[PDB]
Amino acid sequence: GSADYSSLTVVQLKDLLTKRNLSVGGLKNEWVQRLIKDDEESKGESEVSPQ
């Protein structure tokens, strides 16, 4: 995996979270999950659109 927020901090996780526009209304574990999903949305190639 490219992301390892699971080790990061709740402050950095939620900070970067809002930075992505996703959110933080969840939790650290859920933050790393949503983040990992956020970065994975590009699969290391290119982002996508909600269509």
Domain borders along the chain are 1-51
Long-range contacts of 47-50 (CB under 8 A, 24+ apart): none
**Residue 43 to residues 21, 26, 31: CA-CA distances in angstroms?**
19, 23, 18
Which amino acid is present at 17?
L
Class of the domain covering 1-51: mainly alpha
Under DSSP, the state recorded for 39 is: H
Under DSSP, the state recorded for 42 is: T
Which amino acid is present at 13?
L
Q: What is the largest CA-CA distance in the chain?
A: 33
